[PDB]
Amino acid sequence: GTSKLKYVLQDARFFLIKSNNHENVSLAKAKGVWSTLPVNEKKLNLAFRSARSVILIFSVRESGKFQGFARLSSESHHGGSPIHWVLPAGMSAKMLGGVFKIDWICRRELPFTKSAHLTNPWNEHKPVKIGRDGQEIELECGTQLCLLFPPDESIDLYQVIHKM
Template sequence: MRSMGLAPCNAAPVVPFNPRGPPRKPRQSGYAIWVGNLPPSASIADLKDYFSRGATRDIESLFLMSRSNCAFVNYHTEAACVAAMNRFHNSCFEERRLVCRLRRGAAASDASATAAENLASLSVSVDTGAAATDSESPEPLIVGDTKAAATARAAMGTAEPPAGNSSPQTPREKFFVLKSLTTQDLEASVRSGTWATQVHIEQALNKAYDEMENVILIFSANKSGEYFGYARMASKPFDKLVDLKTTSAGTEHVQDLGSPRSIPTPPTATAPKGHIIDDSARGTIFWEAEHSGDEAKSVTKEDGGDGQGPGQGQSRQFRIEWRSTARLPFYRTCGLRNPFNANREVKIARDGTEIEPSVGAKLVQMFHRLVTY
């Protein structure tokens, strides 16, 4: 039986809104090249034309990271990827000599992305901790505070463990970290009481919701150096897909500021028809090819997409009940490690990372331990 616990902490009226969480990623075939030394002025339209040379039917997507002057280009097959690397390495693009490296397999890409995110998280945490030390004395934590633990249990809808029972119990909760690229999306979620996430994360949450008494979601905005708060998953995702670009009454001005734009691109002499996804508010821009035929459809399915093509900006919302929106800086969690994530510090996590239950419970308690004077 699922425990309902306390009422949600937010008293604000519910506003229809579709929080998007992390942005869409381009289709990834597993065969990609990394391209470095791009000129700062390089446009994604020019790049997709350039890297489609000799691979009009094989190019899948191009993800531009303009801040670091590099990009990832995905091709449909390993042979096409190797040929592209040989073709473009040391070639000149706008008077810049390019550096290309093979990035074989999704596992390698995921590992490098994890490493980059871990470094970013550590950097942000150190900066945040230093700033807090310089500007103010950190508020004390009451370590082992039983009142805080009881408050956290009540917020999660979890009963007090039986006295004198020291035998290990089967966990009744699962804990997940969910990431957003903006605090604004999290604030919108507090107003609406809903969230939407990536398909593969949605599947893990669904399974946990079916099996556990409570599924606790701990939210953080990237580069914020803190946890925004935590919530309880209150429903499985609705059957109806919501268009993440659709505005709702009373929220149009908010949605317009943060919505990604899909810009169609016609076929050129080298590149196939496609579309650019411009999510500038979140620092994301990429191009995807639109190949006709069953082959392209199968690639979309293997990629983990929803088969919607350009309409992949759709997701399914689910209800959540916010328990706390007290901000918890990462430096306060120093020393708390997650065995489910190679025993890294709990602050180092990707969107959808599961936290070991006892560690998750301690983390949730920290939201209720902050003492103000």
């Protein structure tokens, strides 16, 4: 059922995360971490302190799909165990700033063909698939998008619900 997921999402902010390759999403799915550029890092840290849950919805560029969604379990932090992302051309490890710890809620894919009926009012009422990295998604739109994902049998929401 959806009672657990709806509880997690009740007071949530949602952000579209765009990745340049599948490798970084695979790393993030296994280690439960994410890093972003400083402008988005500041936005996510503000959101973490202002909402009961902050949800990141991942899409690899040119893939035509979302690859899953996760909930922030911490603000960004520096000086921890270094994450060996595949750094894009001209980007250094210091430019990515802090590491967010995240708990994945769904690691299964959702093709854009299944979200074509959803528009984001906070992005000029464009289809929810459209947005720059870090684009915030309005609550109702983000909730309905997350509810479209298939159930993930590798996920147990027990830990997320306990840390809320």
